[PDB]
């Protein structure tokens, strides 16, 4: 639930150094280790096996400081029309970097800390229950790690 925020704040975070963007947005206010890497890791196999995969979801979305919350959810809901995966949760993140990025390269900075939030919110509401379901992050693990 907060170690949720836990790795979203992670994945970001480490898609804007990787990229040359500054992390200090965040927080600016070892069990999941094994979590936390796994997750890079697929994020990473994920973006070279599908470079331009969110122009058409990012386009829809669109950001501004004006977004709100149940616009993000809309177009996000898109990943899961057929139900959960641990490839469309890999997907989901990657979404969300894709994202921080956008904002970064408008002048937007302050959305970062929002998409988290909104990362966050949505990965509790939608997605931990089929997690749950399907073994937790450990089978999570299993399989990415």
């Given at each position: 639930?907060?170690?949720?925020?836990?790795?979203?704040?992670?994945?970001?975070?480490?898609?804007?150094?990787?990229?040359?963007?500054?992390?200090?947005?965040?927080?600016?206010?070892?069990?999941?280790?094994?979590?936390?890497?796994?997750?890079?890791?697929?994020g990473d196999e994920?973006?070279?096996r599908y470079r331009?995969?969110?122009?058409?979801?990012?386009?829809?979305?669109?950001?501004?400081?004006?977004?709100?919350?149940?616009?993000?959810?809309?177009?996000?809901?898109?990943?899961?029309?057929?139900?959960?995966?641990?490839?469309?949760?890999?997907?989901?993140?990657?979404?969300?970097?894709?994202?921080?990025?956008?904002?970064?390269?408008?002048?937007?900075?302050?959305?970062?800390?929002?998409?988290?939030?909104?990362?966050?919110?949505?990965?509790?509401?939608?997605?931990?229950?089929?997690?749950?379901?399907?073994?937790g992050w450990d089978?999570?693990?299993?399989?990415?790690?």
């Amino acid at each position: 639930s907060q170690s949720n925020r836990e790795l979203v704040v992670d994945f970001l975070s480490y898609k804007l150094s990787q990229k040359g963007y500054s992390w200090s947005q965040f927080s600016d206010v070892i069990p999941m280790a094994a979590v936390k890497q796994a997750l890079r890791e697929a994020g990473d196999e994920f973006e070279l096996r599908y470079r331009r995969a969110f122009s058409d979801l990012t386009s829809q979305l669109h950001i501004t400081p004006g977004t709100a919350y149940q616009s993000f959810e809309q177009v996000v809901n898109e990943l899961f029309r057929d139900g959960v995966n641990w490839g469309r949760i890999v997907a989901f993140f990657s979404f969300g970097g894709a994202l921080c990025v956008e904002s970064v390269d408008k002048e937007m900075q302050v959305l970062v800390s929002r998409i988290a939030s909104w990362m966050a919110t949505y990965l509790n509401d939608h997605l931990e229950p089929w997690i749950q379901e399907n073994g937790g992050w450990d089978t999570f693990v299993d399989l990415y790690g």
